[PDB]
């Protein structure tokens, strides 16, 4: 049981925050609880679109909420029918004026939490646990990455004894601060318990 989170290891450099709002020592508490039940609701009713980051900013009773997705089409609805429903759902808990940009992740095979989700999705549809990994990495290397690595936990294929499958390609230098390693994690609630999917994508540098 070793090893730090690669994002948290990098926050000051080669990775910046999912929440860029100052607060004093008595708002922070609530501007967080909100901040969170936000993602709690967004992530839950927005899986289809496939959301990577759920970026957020503030400046006193207004909120940015720049959601990044692979399939913008799905958040909008043909015209603007869903994006309305969401701005409306938000302000019922967030007693403030909820702004809301939307972004396309131009290549979703280089968004680690998408790759995780992908593989996690396959696992729940009893797929070939070891080839999923194999393919996923390939796909990620195929879309031009510097390296990748995927890990699945245990009860692989409903087996009685927990195990751990991994695969990787190129470089994934977890100790280099100046690396830029999108990391991502997906669950996978199956008929025979949870599996855990981790995904690492090396791209960056100076």
């Amino acid at each position: 049981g070793n090893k730090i989170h690669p994002i948290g290891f990098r926050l000051g450099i080669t990775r910046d925050w999912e929440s860029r709002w100052y607060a004093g020592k008595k708002q922070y508490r609530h501007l967080l609880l909100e901040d969170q039940r936000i993602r709690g609701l967004l992530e839950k009713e927005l899986y289809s679109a496939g959301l990577a980051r759920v970026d957020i900013e503030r400046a006193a009773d207004n909120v940015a909420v720049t959601v990044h997705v692979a399939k913008p089409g799905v958040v909008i609805g043909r015209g603007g029918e869903r994006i309305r429903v969401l701005r409306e759902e938000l302000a019922k808990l967030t007693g403030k004026n909820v702004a809301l940009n939307v972004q396309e992740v131009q290549n979703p095979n280089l968004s680690a939490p998408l790759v995780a989700q992908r593989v996690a999705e396959q696992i729940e549809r009893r797929f070939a646990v070891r080839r999923a990994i194999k393919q996923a990495v390939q796909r990620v290397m195929e879309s031009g990455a510097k390296g990748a690595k995927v890990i699945v936990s245990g009860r692989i294929g409903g087996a009685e004894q927990a195990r751990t499958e991994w695969a990787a390609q190129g470089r994934v230098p977890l100790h280099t601060l100046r690396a830029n390693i999108d990391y991502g994690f997906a669950l996978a609630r199956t008929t025979y318990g949870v599996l855990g999917v981790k995904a690492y994508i090396f791209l960056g540098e100076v």
Binding site: G12, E18, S19, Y28, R29
Partner: protein, 60 residues
């Protein structure tokens, strides 16, 4: 017990000293940093993700 209780701790009680903290996520009594409403665990977690603004690995 940890449902009937996440509920009870929110109710305003007879006597303010019966009152107490709770990790507003990970629903929990002990090591609960009042500047966040966050259990040391459900906290190291967010702190890592970038979901706690300006919070960073300290090293000195």
């Amino acid at each position: 017990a940890r449902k009937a209780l996440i509920e009870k701790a929110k109710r305003t009680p007879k006597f303010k000293v019966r009152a107490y903290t709770r990790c507003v996520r990970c629903g929990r009594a002990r090591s609960v940093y009042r500047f966040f409403g966050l259990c040391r665990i459900c906290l190291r977690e967010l702190a890592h993700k970038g979901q706690l603004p300006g919070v960073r690995k300290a090293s000195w």
